[PDB]
């Protein structure tokens, strides 16, 4: 085929329309569905695919017990077309407790991290075969975007972090051509902690709105140029910070160059993208927990520091329903690049003690230039009807 170039202008976005939903947990109560966590969506030139880090077991299984651990040898990257639930026929494309997948227009590239926490191996699988691999350069938990990577003209950039989750970690941007690591640029700029980046193509560059797990409740931005392999980094300018935990809307802040040091000890994977000078950002409705999910546009939120003027707010998941990792992915339209996002709806441990398992279902929204209504799309599974 032909390499994806992403050389189209960003699509006109007035909001996000519902696109897909797997109902994984609801189907798990009477079917054989994989236990999954940290899902993401990536699209071929033809169709879009779900991805998730399966826990090596199904829900109606004795091994689903104690599935809240992030890194086990049995975790694998599941893969099927968007909408198809993760049933027993799902293809496990690699062993990974951390993953990232992009389609360069010709073949799939999967970056899969597995192994020991302190000696992890990151395998680069392109076109169904292992092409490259790297080891942990910091001898800590080597991790990656946990979302789709972006290939521009055949060069796929993946953001790999290695180091403390609550301190200074070494983040490197790896440039991958047909599975081979052709360049490795260290993270540069004013972002002090970069982890779980939601990358989207901004030609000729790649923009990654990452998660600051150390000090910032404002998401760091990593701009990556796929031509000269140059990295710059800053923080999202909007005063409506998109990382939970966070302060409430009145007291939150962001000044585009430093973490705000407001409830930044933890974080959730999230997304943001610039509609010109505005920012379209999704965040959990609850400030402290991953409960609910909303998306809105902050006027001048990508340029003006501490901008709190929001518009076009949509409630994706209502306040009283659990959410989780969110992320972005891009679809190449007829003449314009559409920005779509997904929300992971985590159910089970540790928040819900009725069951012994931790799993999730995904819901996907695509940006639209037309009109839309309202509604909430939670997981919908009754935890009392689910197997323990």
């Amino acid at each position: 085929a032909e390499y994806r170039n992403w050389s189209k202008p960003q699509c006109n976005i007035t909001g996000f329309a519902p696109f897909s939903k797997d109902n994984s947990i609801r189907l798990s109560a009477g079917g054989d569905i994989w236990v999954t966590r940290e899902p993401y969506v990536s699209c071929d030139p033809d169709k879009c695919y779900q991805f998730a880090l399966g826990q090596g077991t199904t829900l109606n299984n004795g091994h689903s017990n104690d599935t809240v651990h992030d890194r086990t040898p049995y975790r694998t990257l599941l893969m099927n077309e968007l909408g198809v639930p993760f049933h027993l026929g799902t293809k496990q494309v690699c062993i990974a407790w951390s993953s990232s997948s992009c389609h360069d227009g010709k073949a799939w590239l999967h970056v899969c991290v597995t192994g020991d926490d302190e000696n992890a191996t990151a395998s680069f699988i392109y076109n169904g075969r292992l092409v490259d691999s790297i080891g942990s350069w910091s001898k800590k938990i080597l991790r990656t975007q946990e979302s789709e990577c972006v290939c521009i003209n055949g060069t796929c950039t993946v953001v790999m972090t290695d180091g403390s989750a609550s301190g200074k970690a070494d983040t490197k941007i790896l440039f991958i051509e047909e599975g081979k690591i052709v360049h490795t640029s260290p993270l540069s700029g004013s972002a002090q902690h970069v982890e779980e980046c939601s990358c989207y193509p901004r030609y000729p560059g790649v923009r990654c709105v990452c998660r600051d797990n150390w000090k910032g409740s404002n998401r760091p931005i990593v701009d990556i140029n796929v031509k000269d392999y140059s990295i710059v980094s800053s923080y999202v300018c909007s005063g409506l910070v998109g990382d939970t935990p966070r302060k409430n809307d009145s007291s939150s802040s962001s000044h585009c160059l430093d973490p705000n040091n407001e409830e930044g000890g933890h974080g959730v994977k999230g997304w943001a993208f610039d509609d010109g000078n505005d920012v379209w950002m999704g965040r959990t409705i609850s400030e402290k927990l991953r409960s609910g999910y909303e998306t809105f546009k902050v006027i001048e939120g990508w340029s003006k520091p501490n901008s709190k003027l929001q518009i076009n707010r949509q409630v994706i998941v209502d306040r009283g329903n659990r959410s989780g990792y969110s992320g972005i992915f891009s679809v190449e339209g007829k003449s314009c690049i559409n920005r779509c996002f997904y929300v992971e709806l985590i159910r089970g441990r540790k928040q819900e003690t009725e069951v012994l398992w931790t799993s999730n279902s995904i819901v996907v929204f695509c940006g639209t230039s037309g009109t839309y209504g309202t509604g909430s799309w939670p997981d919908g599974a009754d935890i009392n009807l689910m197997p323990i």
Epitope: S7, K8, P9, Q10, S188, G189, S190, R202, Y203, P204, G205, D223, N225, K227, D228, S230, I231, V232, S234, L257, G276
Partner: antibody, heavy 123, light 111 residues
Framework: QVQLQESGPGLVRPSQTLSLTCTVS??????????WTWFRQTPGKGLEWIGY???????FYNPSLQSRLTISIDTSDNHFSLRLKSVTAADTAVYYC???????????????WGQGTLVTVSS | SVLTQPPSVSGAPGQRVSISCTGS?????????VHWYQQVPGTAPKLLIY???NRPSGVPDRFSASKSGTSASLAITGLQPEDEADYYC????????????FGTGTRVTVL
């Protein structure tokens, strides 16, 4: 050959919106391999980079002025524009429209320039 | 931020002069290419050197450039008339975002 021609009002009141347009001749701005750049040179200082853009609309702005400007593109009329908000006595300068060599960032030099328009902010 | 240059550098015809641009950690000292622009006052700047020495076209062989560490130098050999202009060193700055820093501006005055 690429020819750039700045065109905009020469006098803008303070706290108004400065708007300049650079018309490009001899080349198409609709090919996304060049950055269509804006510069300004205050009389007492050197050149200052204002912002970037290409035909696709992926713009980069000077972090100092980033809160104000908006660099737009128009592939139909074959021109790109600059829009500075809330101008002051520091915004009076000679504004140059230029084209970068390529679409990189670290390896960028601006060979093709405009003629330069004197924009004065005063009353 | 900006790069620094001597405010003025003079020189008689025939001899040579040097313009010293000094960078920083997110600057000339980060390995980014240094480009030199010649601007006769009142007119548009003209690109003189790129790649720290790659005189594009129609540029006299008098001008030479060299980068070392966090400093870069532009050498004019000959100091002929019509070389009386402002010379600016441009470089890429990545401390905050995509940024391009110019030199303070050296005025070459051929006595």
């Amino acid at each position: 050959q690429v020819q750039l021609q700045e065109s905009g009002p020469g006098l803008v009141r303070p706290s108004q919106t400065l708007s300049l347009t650079c018309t490009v001749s001899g080349a198409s701005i609709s090919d996304v391999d060049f950055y269509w750049t804006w510069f300004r040179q205050t009389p007492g200082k050197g050149l200052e980079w204002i912002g970037y853009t290409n035909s696709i609309g992926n713009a980069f702005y000077n972090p100092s002025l980033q809160s104000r400007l908006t660099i737009s593109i128009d592939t139909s009329d074959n021109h790109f524009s600059l829009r500075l908000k809330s101008v002051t006595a520091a915004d009076t300068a000679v504004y140059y429209c230029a084209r970068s060599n390529s679409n990189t960032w670290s390896r960028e030099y601006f060979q093709h320039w405009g003629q330069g328009t004197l924009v004065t902010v005063s009353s | 931020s900006v790069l620094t240059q001597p405010p003025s550098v003079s020189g008689a015809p025939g001899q040579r002069v040097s313009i010293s641009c000094t960078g920083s950690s997110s600057n000339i000292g980060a390995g980014f290419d240094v480009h030199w622009y010649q601007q006769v006052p009142g007119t548009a700047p003209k690109l003189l050197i790129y790649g720290n020495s790659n005189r594009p076209s129609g540029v006299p062989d008098r001008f030479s450039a060299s980068k070392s560490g966090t400093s870069a130098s532009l050498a004019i050999t000959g100091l002929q008339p019509e070389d009386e202009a402002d010379y600016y060193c441009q470089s890429y700055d990545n401390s905050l975002s995509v940024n391009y820093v110019f030199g303070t501006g050296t005025r070459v005055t051929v006595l």
